[PDB]
Design an enzyme around this catalytic site. Structure first.
Site, PDB file in Angstrom:
ATOM      1  N   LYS A 164       0.871  -1.238   0.159  1.00  0.00           N
ATOM      2  CA  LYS A 164      -0.059   0.122   0.183  1.00  0.00           C
ATOM      3  C   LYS A 164       0.923   1.263  -0.053  1.00  0.00           C
ATOM      4  CE  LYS A 164      -3.512  -0.589  -1.076  1.00  0.00           C
ATOM      5  NZ  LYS A 164      -4.054  -1.296  -2.327  1.00  0.00           N
TER       6      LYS A 164
ATOM      7  N   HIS B 197      -1.196   4.452  -6.875  1.00  0.00           N
ATOM      8  CA  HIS B 197      -2.862   4.940  -6.864  1.00  0.00           C
ATOM      9  C   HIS B 197      -2.193   6.378  -7.194  1.00  0.00           C
ATOM     10  CE1 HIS B 197      -4.888   1.595  -5.391  1.00  0.00           C
ATOM     11  NE2 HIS B 197      -4.258   1.418  -4.268  1.00  0.00           N
TER      12      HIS B 197
ATOM     13  N   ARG C 191     -14.063 -11.716 -10.429  1.00  0.00           N
ATOM     14  CA  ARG C 191     -13.026 -12.265  -9.339  1.00  0.00           C
ATOM     15  C   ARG C 191     -13.976 -12.014  -8.026  1.00  0.00           C
ATOM     16  NH1 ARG C 191      -8.041 -10.967 -12.880  1.00  0.00           N
ATOM     17  NH2 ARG C 191      -8.775  -8.682 -12.483  1.00  0.00           N
TER      18      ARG C 191
ATOM     19  N   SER D  72     -16.507  -1.988  -4.177  1.00  0.00           N
ATOM     20  CA  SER D  72     -15.993  -0.992  -5.324  1.00  0.00           C
ATOM     21  C   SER D  72     -15.784   0.602  -4.413  1.00  0.00           C
ATOM     22  CB  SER D  72     -16.786  -0.870  -6.554  1.00  0.00           C
ATOM     23  OG  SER D  72     -16.577  -2.242  -6.944  1.00  0.00           O
TER      24      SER D  72
ATOM     25  N   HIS E 142     -10.206  -1.827   1.655  1.00  0.00           N
ATOM     26  CA  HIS E 142      -9.008  -2.896   1.795  1.00  0.00           C
ATOM     27  C   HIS E 142      -9.620  -4.239   2.273  1.00  0.00           C
ATOM     28  CE1 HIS E 142      -9.246  -0.061   5.197  1.00  0.00           C
ATOM     29  NE2 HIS E 142      -8.947  -0.977   5.947  1.00  0.00           N
TER      30      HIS E 142
END
Ligand SMILES: [Cl-]
EC number: 1.5.1.7
Length: 365
Positions: A75, A94, A202, A277, A318
Site C-alpha cells: 500500500k 494509486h 473475481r 468498489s 481494503h
C-alpha cells in the site's frame, strides 16, 4: 542477481504482505537476497520469514537502504512522507488515475531518480493482470455483509456491528460468520436473499464462495452482471433484497443502481449494502447513499433512511485485509513468475511495460 526489501505496511490496520514467507523461500531458492522489515501490522510474524531465510531488519529501514535494493510493499507510504524516492519500488501507488496529490507522489520518484513498478498495472502478454485481490475482496465483503444482516436480527437498532479483527485463517472467518448467521436464523428471521452486482468476476466469485460456505441457499442468490445492469437503474431488486453486494466500479454519469428516494420506503427489505468498489472520491457513484469509507474498527455506517428498517453500508477500501494470510498467499503466488523475472527486468515485457507507464506518467507532471 537481485536484492528484495519487504517494506512494513503503515496504512492503519493493513495486515497483508506483498511477499509471504513461502514466496520469500522460493525466491531465495532462485538466488535472491531478501530483507524483511519487522512489521507489527503484518499477519505474518518475523519467525516465519527467518525460517524462510529472510534477513530480519527494522521497520522503516528501506529509507536508508542501498539504492540497488528493490523495495517491495503493497500500500501507499505515509501522506506525511516527503523525501526523494531513490529506489526501484514495487507497490500499489494509486497515482495513475489522477488521484488527489498524484503529482507530489511522482515528484518524489522524479527528484530521487527512483522507479515505480505499479502492482495494479502489471500485465501479461494478453493484457491480463498478473496478480489481483478481487476474489478475497468479494469473500471478505460477503463475510461482513452476512454478519451485518445477522447483527440486525439479534441486536437493537441502537447498536452497530462492533470492530472486527482480520481473521487469522479462512476457518476462523467461516466459523465467525456461520455462528452469527445461525444465531440470526434462531431469532425466526427469514433466510436472506442476496443480490450480487458483478457476480461473474473475481469479486463476484469470492462473494459467492463465502455465501455457499456459510450455508446461504444458492436459490437465495441473485447473480447480476452486464446482461442485467445494461438495462439501467435504479433497480427495484436492490431494496427488495436482504443484502446487496456490489463488485462493479462505475463512474459514468449514468442512472444509479439505487438512491435515497427508492430506499425511503416502509416496504424495503434491504438491511445491508456491501460496496466492494466503494470510493468516496467517485464523482458519479452508482450507490449514492454513503459519504464515509468505513474501517475494521468501525466497519458499518448508517444509511439515513426516513422510512423502512435500519440500513447500513460497508465501504472498507481494503477488504482483502480481513483475510490477510490467504489473500497475501494467493496474490504473492500469482506475482511470483514476474518476480522471478526481476534479474532481467530490462527485457522482461511485464516489467518493461510497467517502467514505460511510470515514464509516461512522469512526463505528465
Ligand atoms: Cl512462529
Amino acid at each position: 542477481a537481485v536484492t528484495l526489501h519487504l517494506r512494513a505496511e503503515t496504512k492503519p490496520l493493513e495486515a497483508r504482505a506483498a511477499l509471504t514467507p513461502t514466496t520469500v523461500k522460493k525466491l531465495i531458492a532462485k538466488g535472491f537476497k531478501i530483507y524483511v522489515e519487522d512489521s507489527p501490522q503484518s499477519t505474518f510474524n518475523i519467525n516465519e520469514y527467518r525460517q524462510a531465510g529472510a534477513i530480519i531488519v527494522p521497520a522503516g529501514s528501506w529509507k536508508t537502504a542501498p539504492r540497488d535494493r528493490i523495495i517491495i510493499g503493497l500500500k501507499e507510504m505515509p501522506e506525511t512522507d516527503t523525501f526523494p524516492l531513490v529506489h526501484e519500488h514495487i507497490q500499489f501507488a494509486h497515482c495513475y488515475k489522477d488521484q488527489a496529490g498524484w503529482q507530489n507522489v511522482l515528484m518524489r520518484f522524479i527528484k530521487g531518480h527512483g522507479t515505480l513498478y505499479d502492482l495494479e498495472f502489471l500485465e501479461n502478454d494478453q493484457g491480463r493482470r498478473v496478480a489481483a485481490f478481487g476474489f478475497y475482496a468479494g469473500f471478505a465483503g460477503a463475510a461482513l455483509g452476512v454478519r451485518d444482516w445477522a447483527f440486525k436480527q439479534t441486536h437493537s437498532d441502537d447498536e452497530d456491528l462492533p470492530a472486527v479483527s482480520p481473521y487469522p485463517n479462512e476457518k476462523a472467518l467461516v466459523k465467525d460468520v456461520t455462528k452469527d448467521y445461525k444465531e440470526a436464523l434462531a431469532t425466526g428471521a427469514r433466510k436472506p436473499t442476496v443480490l450480487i452486482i458483478g457476480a461473474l468476476g473475481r469479486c463476484g466469485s469470492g462473494a459467492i464462495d463465502l455465501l455457499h460456505k456459510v450455508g446461504i441457499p444458492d436459490a437465495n442468490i441473485l447473480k447480476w452482471d452486464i446482461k442485467e445492469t445494461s438495462r439501467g437503474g435504479p433497480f427495484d431488486e436492490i431494496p427488495q433484497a436482504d443484502i446487496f453486494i456490489n463488485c462493479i466500479y462505475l463512474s459514468k454519469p449514468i442512472a444509479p443502481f439505487t438512491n435515497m428516494e427508492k430506499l425511503n420506503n416502509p416496504n424495503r427489505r434491504l438491511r445491508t449494502v456491501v460496496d466492494v468498489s466503494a470510493d468516496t472520491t467517485n464523482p458519479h457513484n452508482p450507490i449514492p447513499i454513503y459519504t464515509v469509507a468505513t474501517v475494521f474498527n468501525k466497519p458499518t455506517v448508517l444509511v439515513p433512511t426516513t422510512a423502512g428498517p435500519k440500513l447500513s453500508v460497508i465501504s472498507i477500501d481494503h477488504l482483502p485485509s480481513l483475510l490477510p494470510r490467504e489473500a497475501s498467499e494467493f496474490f504473492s503466488h500469482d506475482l511470483l513468475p514476474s518476480l522471478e523475472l526481476l534479474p532481467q527486468r530490462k527485457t522482461a515485457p511485464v516489467w518493461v511495460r510497467a517502467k514505460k507507464l511510470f515514464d509516461r506518467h512522469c512526463a505528465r507532471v
